Design an enzyme around this catalytic site. Structure first.
Site, PDB file in Angstrom:
ATOM      1  N   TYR A 509      41.168 -12.305  77.113  1.00  0.00           N
ATOM      2  CA  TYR A 509      42.564 -12.042  77.419  1.00  0.00           C
ATOM      3  C   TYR A 509      43.404 -12.820  76.398  1.00  0.00           C
ATOM      4  CZ  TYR A 509      47.120 -11.345  79.397  1.00  0.00           C
ATOM      5  OH  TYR A 509      48.448 -11.042  79.554  1.00  0.00           O
ATOM      6  N   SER A 592      44.994  -5.098  77.732  1.00  0.00           N
ATOM      7  CA  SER A 592      46.365  -5.493  77.564  1.00  0.00           C
ATOM      8  C   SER A 592      46.526  -6.442  76.382  1.00  0.00           C
ATOM      9  CB  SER A 592      47.184  -5.719  78.846  1.00  0.00           C
ATOM     10  OG  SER A 592      48.516  -6.170  79.119  1.00  0.00           O
ATOM     11  N   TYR A 593      47.020  -7.678  76.603  1.00  0.00           N
ATOM     12  CA  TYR A 593      46.968  -8.703  75.539  1.00  0.00           C
ATOM     13  C   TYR A 593      45.528  -8.868  75.113  1.00  0.00           C
ATOM     14  CZ  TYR A 593      48.771 -12.570  72.661  1.00  0.00           C
ATOM     15  OH  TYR A 593      49.165 -13.340  71.613  1.00  0.00           O
ATOM     16  N   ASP A 670      51.715   4.679  81.006  1.00  0.00           N
ATOM     17  CA  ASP A 670      51.927   3.227  80.929  1.00  0.00           C
ATOM     18  C   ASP A 670      53.402   2.869  80.664  1.00  0.00           C
ATOM     19  OD1 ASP A 670      51.424   0.523  80.985  1.00  0.00           O
ATOM     20  OD2 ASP A 670      49.963   0.546  79.392  1.00  0.00           O
ATOM     21  N   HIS A 702      49.630   1.025  83.655  1.00  0.00           N
ATOM     22  CA  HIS A 702      48.996  -0.089  82.951  1.00  0.00           C
ATOM     23  C   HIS A 702      47.678  -0.597  83.544  1.00  0.00           C
ATOM     24  CE1 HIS A 702      48.886  -3.038  79.853  1.00  0.00           C
ATOM     25  NE2 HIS A 702      48.753  -4.015  80.727  1.00  0.00           N
TER      26      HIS A 702
END
Ligand SMILES: CC(=O)N[C@@H]1[C@@H](O)[C@H](O)[C@@H](CO)O[C@H]1O
Ligand SMILES: CC(=O)N[C@@H]1[C@@H](O)[C@H](O)[C@@H](CO)O[C@H]1O
Ligand SMILES: CC(=O)N[C@@H]1[C@@H](O)[C@H](O)[C@@H](CO)O[C@H]1O
Ligand SMILES: CC(=O)N[C@@H]1[C@@H](O)[C@H](O)[C@@H](CO)O[C@H]1O
Ligand SMILES: CC(=O)N[C@@H]1[C@@H](O)[C@H](O)[C@@H](CO)O[C@H]1O
Ligand SMILES: *[C@@H]1O[C@H](CO)[C@@H](O)[C@H](O)[C@H]1NC(C)=O
Ligand SMILES: *[C@@H]1O[C@H](CO)[C@@H](O)[C@H](O)[C@H]1NC(C)=O
Ligand SMILES: *[C@H]1O[C@H](CO)[C@@H](O)[C@H](O)[C@H]1NC(C)=O
Lengths: 728, 728
Positions: A509, A592-593, A670, A702
């Site tokens: 992450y 995501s990140y 998203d 998302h």
């Protein structure tokens, strides 16, 4: 000889964690739904009565998503027709059940498509938001008073937050804040009139012939942000024929020279509100303490009373400036502040005075201030045994701050190393919740002498079950990079042999202030990859990670997509040199990140990873929202940080993907990290001749969280990984 | 011959086919471009000069896209700043350069962003469309004259088409038509006011912060359609003080009752126009002949000279009403018609007289009428050797129909069974253009005695190159399903060994009136698949296919996704039997209609196919436009054909895809078959738990044709097939 943990078990939620969700309702009593009855428990003796029978509302005609009971408990609110919007916001219908009679209220109903509702903290008053306007019912069977009349869909919001505010600022749809008396209603207004609109297709049902375009005011980095005003209404003086009077509280002069936000509102007393504000360059924040004039009906915030926080090293707070916890009297408060050495610790402030006092010190951080009496401040930190991955509850005697006692440290020390807590009013009793590293454990305790009272949920049913599976294990340790200690967990296959060479999946992450190495028990994808597929799943907290001080966390200030990326490779490299990881099979994946980092790693040319998966990744920081991005990157202009905005895109390193195998996945609905972001990666790969895999998931947001998309995505990723690691 | 035909070869175009593209400018002269020189050729003698030097516009300033020379050689149009729109539309800037001086004209230039320009068929008048409105320049240096003032983006189109008319009706952006005098300008005006829009995102270059939303008026099956009107302007009576008078020709009373299309516009004489109209249920069609009343200034369509075309088995024409070819006097015409045996033949009509006489007849079909003289009608047919995948030029003596000469059958019977032709004005000469099965040949002939003047291009440069590639070979045959011949084709691996067992890729299209089994010579993907991968590629023409008359073409009427789908399977089944096809390794692929047919097959549960690829596939006929769909499908209402619209989606088959490996591919900016079609496929697959592979291509339209995206998709598809087949 036993069964292994399988994909199915993960997806079909076979092995279920049992929870114990309670709502304190006074200093000694709490609410609990058991076998669908609502019960009140006595903390002291452990006995219970039935508040609301499960049988009530079986003829009511709608299935009920949620409820909320009056504080001064004569009404219950029933939420039905729930329609989700974003992460916190949603729309619903409501009915009110009169508890004293055997009756639903029938006239003056809270309308349909109500966007938010709240009881006052005492009594049974109601604020609700409908079409972006605030309303107040004094009694549940009476007509509401309209407070605002400016509500306009997507444009002006009273009492609710717009997209960025919901997501990045308050983690909540709500922007209403009752006085502790109930006398006042404080509320924020947002104006999105000039905020640009992200548009995207929703296809919905097969029977829709033309796709709908969805359009959401969403300020990406450097765009026009929503403005905000703040108002306070006195709910005790409302007329049926006089429009209510909302009094404005203006931000300070030093917030009005430029773009700013409202980041926090806390009531201090019945007549004092706390308002923290923030500059748009999240360098600099102001706390204003506003008093109520009895004679004038006005609210004044004395300048000689403001409290300023700045940083030269980074931004203010972990994600936003911290929350003040006030003394009963309201003349002082306690609040988490980064100390001189860079460590987040509790500072005692007096309201009229200016500097503050540190009440804790050391090479660990405070995570939260949980309760506060005249005698005691209760908090959570990662002090215990020096493991930042760890969480425990502590008790400061306020007459002498060196007398700290740890409440959770040694209750069940091999089983329980990650607690959270839930104090009754007036910190008389608390529930503890150990989240790991063993099965979660919910206990009840009395503050008086900190006697353990009673186990609530021990998850023994799960334990008996998991005795028959080939559970993976978890190694939590640290490596050294350039003199500093960084932590990683590994999830290890059953019967791990250190002489063998295992395939390794780096689960990433790595966002600003993240923590992926910790003591918590999870039953998840990794669990299956380790139990069945014999894959070590490793995770690693590098620079930019949190809970370990500023030196590490602010290392990435203005430089996203950099030290956090390098450090993931440096640790993957090190896991390689250990003699149980087969370096020919190292993969990497992140949502995501996580996806942005996985992609930045796949494109680094490290040659360390065979392959990897980026799900719903950020690809370029100008695509993400202002409040999050600007907090780490400043503004994307030549006078500020354009250079590094441009230097840190996934697309900039497309060529390097030719050396790796890549699966790129993104749901088309998203609203958060826009499909645009994966659509610019894929184009850049195409523009350069790099083959790769893709998966869109029609109308998923998302989290790609619909039952089907969940099963499907994780199915897709399993196949991609088994075969990446040449596994049949 | 050692080296093989390579994917890079296909993609990169190692081996190009040489062309010869001429534009006749009289009955004995044409232009050819050699280098960037335009050369004029005397057809009778072969002498030639440089008409226009390759170096004439070195100091032009802008890159020249395309030219057009006036029909009196006096001026040239230069096209620059070309920007694509849809399949035929675009905008460009234009310059007119004088040939009798040697100077670009600078007064009254064609405006920038011009949508369409054309010269009058004789002389040097210009008509053009700017901002949806029509302008007329009598002279290139002179101010233009405004014919229409009702233009408006995506609402009113004058002189140019909207989206459906461009793609489905006219195959052209142009909705203008000069009379041969260049006296009258006829033009259609389209009204899309109540036409619903398709919206999709367009991501664009990186630097774009927010995707743009594309909005195109597009009537899907059953929706509100564009209205049309038709007008004729007298180009010679224009004044610059007065506004232009446009005379309207209205549609026949029997078209005006409901929704209808303008099909076809053909000037017959200097003073007479043929309009064809089509009912929204496309089984009725009316041709009107319309004459200039010299006296009144009007245009009258006499109902005496009206003609009706009806189909009782299907729809009218192949993709629409066939075009008439008028004899010079304007009093008679020839036009292709379904005969009473259901085969398409040349029919003779006399303007005021009933019925018509068929001048050709048989168990084969006229493909097109090409040329009309006083003594002869020339035409193209598939008679030769009962081969429906072949095409030859033919000659009919107008004074005795039974006197029919084949012009091209025997020119080179081994190299050449597939001609097209381009006749000079007054038919004095023709260029025969042979497409296969051997390399394309291009020859010029003279109509007088059908003498072969000269070989224009014989592709000898290619011939020698290919001698050095291990080229695949093409087998053209047929099988009998009932007591009917259906023709297939196979691209066969070099050194083919009828006692080895070869993987088979079935390459589908199979839409109404299609032909995938012919004698055309192609260098394409299947060429690579066959030569480099030793895969057999087979195409097959079952029910619904064309040029074998109506029993077969109309078998699919109101029934898309039935018989044509069934027939592909049965055909693969027949390939199974033959002892050179490995039946563990059959695959199917297709694009547009063939992408739909593939998916439909794949999800049929036949067990014949291991896997298959579908690119921009249709999934559900309600998603596709009205002109095409309803032509085969009727209307999606309960009283008409709703049942089969619903029984024939890709979605309803999802459960069956568990059995096969699916590849699903689409361009995000496909405006013909909308991304939605595939977005719906993937959802249904997600919902039912089937795994499959995907690829979107961002900003690609229907053809996925940018050179990089083109290369990326065949590469991707090549890998997918290679691994589906256990091929390294
Ligand atoms: C919440 C609840 O049921 N608590 C009850 C309390 O009200 C009662 O007074 C007591 C002794 O009877 O038992 C306990
Ligand atoms: C009371 C109110 O606000 N409106 C409606 C109610 O009248 C209706 O029966 C139903 C329809 O959605 O839901 C609620
Ligand atoms: C020829 C014309 O009328 N169109 C314009 C021209 O005036 C100008 O030089 C240029 C700059 O935008 O664009 C083109
Ligand atoms: C120029 C023209 O024909 N415009 C018409 C408009 O007047 C009409 O109201 C509309 C209704 O469909 O269609 C369009
Ligand atoms: C110079 C002139 O005649 N102007 C007219 C204009 O006022 C009118 O609106 C239009 C509509 O036909 O035609 C032109
Ligand atoms: C209601 O609670 C009782 C008390 O244990 C339980 O036996 C019963 O199953 C519950 N009924 C429903 C319908 O949930
Ligand atoms: C919202 O902002 C715009 C300017 O951005 C202004 O014109 C408008 O009046 C504002 N509305 C309210 C009610 O605050
Ligand atoms: C061909 O030659 C003739 C006679 O020399 C000449 O007049 C004519 O213009 C030439 N035509 C071309 C196309 O060069």
């Amino acid at each position: 000889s036993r069964k292994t943990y399988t994909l199915t078990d993960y997806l079909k939620n076979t092995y279920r964690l049992k929870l114990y969700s309670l709502r304190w309702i006074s200093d000694h009593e709490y609410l609990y739904k058991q076998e669908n009855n609502i019960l009140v428990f006595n903390a002291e003796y452990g006995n219970s009565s039935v508040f609301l029978e499960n049988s009530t509302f079986d003829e009511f005609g709608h299935s009920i998503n949620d409820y909320s009971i009056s504080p001064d408990g004569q009404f219950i609110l029933l939420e039905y027709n729930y329609v989700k919007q974003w992460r916190h916001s949603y729309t619903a219908s409501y009915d009110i059940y009169d508890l004293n009679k055997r009756q639903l209220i029938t006239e003056e109903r809270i309308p349909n498509n109500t966007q938010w509702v709240t009881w006052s903290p005492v009594g049974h008053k109601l604020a609700y938001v409908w079409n972006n306007d605030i309303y107040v019912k004094i009694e549940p069977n009476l007509p509401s008073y309209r407070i605002t009349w400016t509500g306009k869909e997507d444009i002006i919001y009273n009492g609710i937050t717009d997209w960025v505010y919901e997501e990045e600022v308050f983690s909540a749809y709500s922007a209403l804040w009752w006085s502790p008396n109930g006398t006042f209603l404080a509320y924020a207004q947002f104006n999105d009139t000039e905020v640009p609109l992200i548009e995207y297709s929703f296809y919905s049902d097969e029977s829709l012939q033309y796709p709908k375009t969805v359009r959401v005011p969403y300020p990406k980095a450097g765009a026009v942000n929503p403005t905000v005003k703040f108002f306070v209404v006195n709910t005790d003086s409302l007329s049926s024929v006089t429009n209510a009077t909302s009094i404005q509280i203006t931000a300070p002069a030093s917030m009005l020279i430029g773009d700013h936000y409202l980041c926090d509102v806390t009531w201090a007393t019945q007549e004092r509100i706390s308002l923290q504000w923030l500059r748009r360059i999240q360098n600099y924040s102001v706390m204003d303490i506003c008093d109520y004039d009895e004679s004038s009906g006005r609210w004044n915030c004395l300048v000689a009373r403001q409290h300023i926080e700045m940083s030269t090293t980074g931004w203010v707070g972990r994600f936003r400036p911290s929350e003040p916890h006030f003394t009963l009297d309201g003349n002082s408060f306690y609040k988490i502040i980064s100390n001189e050495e860079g460590y987040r610790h509790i500072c005692y402030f007096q309201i009229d005075k200016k500097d503050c006092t540190f009440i804790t010190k050391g090479t660990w951080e405070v995570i939260g201030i949980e309760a506060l009496t005249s005698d005691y401040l209760y908090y959570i930190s990662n002090e215990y045994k020096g493991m930042p991955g760890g969480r425990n509850l502590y008790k400061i005697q306020l007459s002498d701050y060196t007398k700290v006692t740890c409440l959770s440290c040694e209750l069940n020390p091999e089983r329980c190393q990650y607690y959270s807590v839930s104090f009754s009013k007036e910190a008389k009793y608390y529930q503890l919740r150990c989240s790991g590293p063993g099965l979660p454990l919910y206990t009840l305790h009395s503050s008086v002498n900190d006697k353990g009272l009673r186990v609530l949920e021990d998850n023994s049913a799960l334990d008996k079950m998991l005795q028959n599976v080939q559970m993976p294990s978890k190694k939590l340790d640290f490596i050294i990079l350039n003199e500093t200690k960084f932590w990683y967990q590994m999830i290890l296959p059953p019967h791990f042999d250190k002489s063998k060479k295992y395939p390794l999946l780096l689960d990433v992450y790595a966002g600003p202030c993240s923590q992926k190495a910790d003591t918590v028990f999870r039953l998840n994808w990794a669990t299956y990859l380790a139990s069945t597929e014999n894959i070590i799943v490793a995770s690693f907290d590098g620079r930019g990670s949190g809970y370990q001080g500023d030196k590490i966390m602010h290392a990435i200030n203005r430089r996203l997509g950099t030290f956090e990326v390098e450090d993931q490779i440096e640790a993957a490299r090190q896991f390689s040199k250990m003699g149980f990881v087969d370096n020919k099979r190292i993969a990497i994946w992140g949502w995501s990140y996580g996806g942005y980092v996985t992609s930045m790693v796949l494109g680094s040319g490290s040659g360390v990873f065979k392959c990897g998966i980026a799900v719903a990744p950020v690809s370029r920081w100008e695509y993400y929202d202002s409040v999050y991005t600007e907090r780490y990157m400043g503004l994307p202009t030549p006078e500020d940080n354009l250079d590094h905005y441009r230097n840190s895109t996934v697309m900039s390193r497309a060529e390097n993907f030719k050396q790796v195998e890549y699966l790129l996945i993104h749901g088309t609905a998203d609203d958060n990290v826009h499909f645009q972001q994966s659509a610019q990666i894929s184009k850049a790969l195409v523009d350069v001749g790099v083959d790769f895999q893709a998966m869109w998931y029609t109308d998923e947001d998302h989290g790609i969280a619909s039952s089907t998309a969940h099963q499907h995505i994780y199915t897709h990723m399993s196949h991609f990984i088994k075969q990446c690691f040449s596994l049949p």
